[PDB]
Design a protein around this ligand. Structure first.
Ligand code: HEM
Ligand code: HEM
Ligand SMILES: NNC(=O)c1ccncc1
Ligand SMILES: NNC(=O)c1ccncc1
Ligand SMILES: [Cl-]
Ligand SMILES: [Cl-]
Ligand code: NA
Ligand code: NA
Lengths: 713, 713
């Protein structure tokens, strides 16, 4: 069946902006997951999950009689696809149940784990999503086995189709580095935005880098991949040691026994995969990773035995029954219990990646401290497990149910509670007039508010204008934000705010976060008036100002835009074409193709480009809100060519005279090239479309201003 | 970027059901194209188009000073992708402007024709769709050159993304037959549903079959492909002769001069392609097909010179400047004008496929009659051109504006006007009660109404329950429709109708087409009652009964379902998996994945399977409307295996006892295998879902009942 993707594999794919339509969603347009979850009897759900832990099913018998380890690994993998670079992956959409993650090699047999949860899912129905259930089940596993969690928030709404995520370019599962589509270059540099060492792994290879069983080298990969999942050294050691306090791995026989992954299995397998011809195919004969390691003397109970073993023995390199590299404790007694046979015991074993916690010098010091102070280990793991499993849930206002921790954590980019009356519509009109009387231009007001709001990404629900973090390090210094002009605009807004707030009775005040947005609205109003349209822009108050100490500077670096097509900004020269980067950004902002089109066309004419660039400013009435961008872009009286100096900048000349009319980047011209985008630009560039352009612009502007406003949801 | 399609190339692609969401649509959800078109000043549009015809642009100079020929070929190609086998292709969605059709080799330089129309599109905006404008432009071309068209209907709403259409399996444009993905097998049998001889052609190869310049052989491809586009011999000769009365081909130099098709061209080309390094690249130097033929002495005026030349000279095999086979008149004077140089003239030329009209014996008699009687030629062509360009527009109720022809054509599957009062809601309740008192079962009433309504396909908007054609040849004899049971149900319904209609005052009556649907509604209400739910199934009267004499039997053959997963029906053994056929049918019925899921699950338990098969009937309360399908499908207590006798039927056995519980086909079990479908099935199989399943079933049943009801749009 030959498709457009086969004929034109490097054309832009806009379908990624149109996933998650109401067409694929089986719930009404009215279904609100938060409200269904708020009625769930969470306690009853936890009781059922507690019972499930030791209700072994014959089609996938429970190791040691307890599914706890399996469910902790299930939950860890649901969370563990998260990348800080784009905020994609993570547990927040329940994507583990869809392709490709349902069939990743590292997710082998987690199909069985999710099938075990079906009766509970079915019983509670829409009131608990798969996405919430997977994490809750991890929590309950930990609790069942004697570990007290830091807490749990519901509110991860289920999704209904696979996300479009760049997981790499390799065409072979688990391909080792240096192939034709290598994710590594230079001195083992992993390409952004990837956060795993091989296609179909979560973070690293348990045998060591590219299969080489060097724990020191393995530590380097661990540290890099975990940093790319937002975890520092302490959190990392706590998570790995904490997780490998429980359960075991499965490699009872050769991996050639294991058949097709779920998405490749036959229809009779009913959504399950990795069927094994080794012996009974399950239980004591299970093959998952190929490794055969049990870490502790009590695999179904919280202990301090991980670090006791890690430091208490010396380790020797050996092989699992499947042929995989792993480590066995030299001269040890058989103290580890067998998962199925009460008469067999085994020597302590470890993976290469466990030994990393000992033999990397920085990890070693943390592992020692946790060894000597187990209460610090327990607390670090609890905190890290909460972080891991909630990292992509967004602001605290989205957290539901009775187990939400009251402690506010730095990584949540917290926003202070509003404790005063908010501005009303009269106050908003007075502020907007003061803004316009101060001398700030349309371009300044629009650029500033765009800069503040457009850090939001729906992937992990970080960023947005709430908080006024654009006035703090590091946002205030980002090149795309034009630090010098930004400083000037903020100093003017701050004087307006000080004066308005000092005039108030009764505790009313306006936050700078609100005023930045409100000021951008005034700029759009002014621009509409410059074009002869009478427009009021909607504005919702209630944003607050976060302090510098509430803003982790390092964590904030990943939100820096290195490409923002909306401002015609590229930080350097990338191997990814700019128009691909524009679509990627539109996706993070939750924009459809029509929204992205109208938005960019308006921003160009309002003066939002970085550095006052003229590229794509296809108008003679800059700072007026018109559809000029489109009308001029589509004018066949102009011919375009890439410039001598740069293949990425284009000159548009009068076809008859050869005179230069405009210049543009690939981001500008793509709207006139791509057949679906051009169809959109046409709508907005038609003679009957001036009002529609202004109205659709206002609506999309307001949408971007409100992206993070979960306090109103 | 490696995708799910790369890893699992034979998994089902559900995205095809979720195109044309509101997300991709730049118009408000309120936009009604029909109402915008009805206020268009169509006369003013045709005046602008008329002026455009002879206003040559230097970027693509008009041959002979007139764009007419170019626009006729543009409109012919817009329409000429149509296939009767699935109704896909055609002009009715304006898909020529999107991938892949925008870049087919046969559509070369029609990018220039569409660009020429941009000023007029831009002037009239949303009041005329691209889809309508392409056809109108061809009409105006013909009119400006002296040809009287049979009429024009507007109402083709624009679309905003490529359709997913199977155009063949070849991986090389224009691949010759007999390759690894050959569309031909046996004695030159073209695979259904294809209607062109090579990938990226409209119908046939202008040089002859696989490039072999034998007009006799070419005539066989012409006849086959045109029949597959719903054209008989007379229509075919009229179309080809009629078209090639105008304009010329373009092959001024070697084809190697011609660059990338639009979807492959650089961003600077702004949506145009096939840029030519040959001399000026355009005009007198134009290269399109590679052939260099001008058919008549007045290429910008309607004439009967095509047939005068065809019969008046003898023809010699020759080559264009690009190397293509074509024919030149032996010993002729230079009587054909040059497109750009008034001092240069040329001999008559023909394509191999033109000579087919003379040298095929059946075409020859038609071409002679048209030769001797050009008034018959003009009338046949007018009629054929109307048919061609409207074939996929659907019922007459969708035809808009002031040039709709009053004559009703058999190919339109016409439906008589309703001339009497319609039944009201109390009448509908009395009819439903009489239906249920007659002893027709839930199963019979549902099967019958499904059989009648489910012939509809949104691709060409043919079929549906309006007309009561299920009582007529050939529908009454299709094996899927269970002819003997159908006859029994219809006889009972007809006696109820005769008695209701005989009791009325005031000319009120009910059509059998309405009653068949209404009776299906009664079946579903009774099924819901059997499960303890009281619902009313909505019903809209106003269908009418068409006669046998108003039903072209041969044209109706292509609507026969050979695969209907909704009735668990497959007519024979196909190369395509049945679950793929199910998705194909869902797409033709305009169903989303959730609608297809709910609908199939309900139809199973209502007894809609052909032949009373138990396959997929996963309930112990058949004829009760419950969600049993899903609850039992998803029960992990049952294990499934393909049967000894058949790899396409499966047995479901109790996992503990080995007892046989159910049987199912691939269509049944796909809902428990495919990860996106199983996520849907889960919603409907959850303990809180019984009411939602009934509500969603009823809505989708009603939707299918109404698919053809453009009289209410
Ligand atoms: C360097 C990072 C990590 C590596 C390379 C790694 C590797 C593995 C491997 C290969 C398995 C065996 C899979 C099998 O054959 O069944 C496994 C099991 C497991 N891991 Fe990890 N792991 C890592 C981090 C984590 C973390 C962060 C957690 C949780 C906080 C976790 C919890 C588990 C648990 C509970 C199991 C046991 C599964 C069972 O009992 O069925 N691991 N790990
Ligand atoms: C067996 C069927 C047909 C074949 C193989 C065929 C082939 C061709 C070819 C190869 C060209 C030249 C393209 C170029 O180099 O610019 C052409 C031109 C043309 N064809 Fe057809 N054609 C067929 C049927 C039709 C029909 C059904 C129509 C309309 C009723 C039509 C109308 C035209 C016109 C108007 C042109 C002139 C283009 C211009 O003046 O720029 N043809 N045809
Ligand atoms: N792959 N996922 C995203 O790009 C995304 C998800 C949710 N909202 C916005 C963006
Ligand atoms: N390829 N196109 C179709 O299958 C279709 C188009 C419009 N409505 C329904 C089905
Ligand atoms: Cl994602
Ligand atoms: Cl189509
Ligand atoms: Na995410
Ligand atoms: Na069609």
């Amino acid at each position: 069946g030959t498709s457009n993707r086969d004929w034109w594999p490097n054309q832009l794919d806009l379908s990624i902006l149109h996933r998650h339509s109401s067409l694929s969603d089986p719930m009404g347009k009215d279904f609100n997951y938060a409200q269904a979850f708020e009625k769930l009897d969470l306690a009853a759900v936890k009781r059922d999950l507690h019972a499930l832990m030791t209700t072994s099913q014959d089609w996938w018998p429970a190791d040691f009689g307890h599914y706890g380890g399996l469910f902790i690994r299930m939950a860890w993998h649901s969370a563990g696809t998260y990348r800080t670079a784009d905020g994609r992956g993570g547990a927040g959409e329940g994507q583990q149940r869809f392709a490709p993650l349902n069939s990743w090699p590292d997710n082998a047999n987690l199909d069985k784990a999710r099938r075990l949860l079906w009766p509970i899912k079915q019983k509670y129905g829409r009131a608990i999503s798969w996405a919430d259930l997977l994490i809750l089940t991890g929590n309950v596993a930990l609790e069942s086995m004697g570990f007290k969690t830091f807490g749990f928030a519901g509110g991860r709404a289920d999704t209904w189709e696979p996300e479009d995520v760049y997981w790499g370019s390799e065409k072979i599962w688990l391909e080792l580095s240096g192939g034709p589509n290598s994710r590594y270059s230079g001195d083992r540099q992993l390409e952004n935005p990837l956060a795993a060492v091989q296609m179909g792994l979560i973070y690293v290879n348990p045998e060591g880098p590219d299969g080489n069983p060097d724990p020191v080298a393995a530590a380097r990969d661990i540290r890099d991949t975990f940093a790319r999942m937002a975890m520092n050294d302490e959190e990392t050691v706590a998570l790995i040691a904490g997780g490998h306090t429980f359960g075991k791995t499965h490699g009872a026989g050769p991996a050639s026994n294991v058949g097709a992954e779920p998405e490749a299995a036959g229809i009779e397998a009913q959504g399950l995969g990795w069927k094994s011809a080794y012996r009974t195919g399950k239980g004591a004969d299970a093959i998952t990773s190929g490794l055969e390691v049990t870490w502790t003397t009590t695999p179904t109970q919280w202990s301090h035995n991980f670090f006791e073993n890690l430091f208490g023995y010396e380790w020797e390199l050996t092989k699992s029954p499947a042929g995989a590299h792993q480590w066995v404790a030299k001269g040890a007694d058989a103290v580890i219990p067998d998962a199925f046979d009460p008469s067999k015991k085994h020597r302590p074993t470890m993976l290469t990646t466990d030994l990393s916690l000992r033999f990397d010098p920085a990890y070693e010091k943390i592992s020692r401290r946790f060894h000597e102070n187990p209460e610090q280990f327990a607390d670090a793991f609890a905190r890290a497990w909460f972080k891991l499993t909630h990292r992509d849930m967004g602001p605290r206002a989205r957290y539901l149910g009775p187990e939400v921790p009251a402690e506010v954590l730095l990584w949540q980019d917290p926003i202070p509670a509003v404790d005063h009356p908010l501005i009303d519509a009269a106050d908003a009109a007075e502020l907007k007039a003061k803004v316009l009387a101060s001398g700030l231009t349309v371009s300044q007001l629009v650029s500033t508010a765009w800069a503040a709001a457009s850090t939001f990404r729906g992937s992990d629900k970080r960023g947005g204008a709430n908080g006024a973090r654009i006035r703090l390090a590091p946002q205030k210094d980002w090149e795309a934000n034009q630090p010098e002009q930004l400083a000037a605009v903020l100093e003017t807004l701050e004087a307006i705010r000080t004066a308005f707030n000092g005039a108030q009775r009764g505790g009313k005040q306006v936050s700078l976060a609100d005023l930045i947005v409100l000021a951008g609205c005034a700029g759009v109003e002014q621009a509409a008036k410059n074009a002869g349209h009478a427009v009021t822009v909607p504005f919702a108050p209630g944003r607050a100002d976060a302090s510098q100490e509430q803003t982790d500077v390092e964590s904030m670096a990943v939100l820096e835009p290195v490409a923002d097509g909306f401002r015609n900004y590229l930080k350097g020269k990338y191997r990814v074409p700019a128009e691909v980067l524009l679509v990627d950004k539109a996706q993070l902002l939750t924009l459809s193709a029509p929204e992205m089109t109208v938005l960019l066309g308006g921003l160009r004419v309002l003066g939002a480009n970085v550095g006052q660039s003229r590229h794509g400013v296809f108008t003679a009435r800059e700072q007026a809100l018109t559809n000029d961008f489109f009308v001029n872009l589509l004018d066949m009286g102009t011919e375009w060519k890439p410039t001598a100096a740069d293949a990425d900048v284009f000159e548009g000349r009068d076809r008859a005279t050869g005179e230069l009319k405009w210049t543009g980047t690939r981001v500008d011209l793509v709207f006139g090239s791509h057949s679906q985008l051009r169809a959109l630009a046409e709508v907005y560039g038609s003679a009957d479309a001036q009002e529609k352009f202004v109205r659709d612009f206002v609506a999309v502007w307001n949408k971007v201003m409100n992206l993070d406003r979960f306090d109103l949801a």
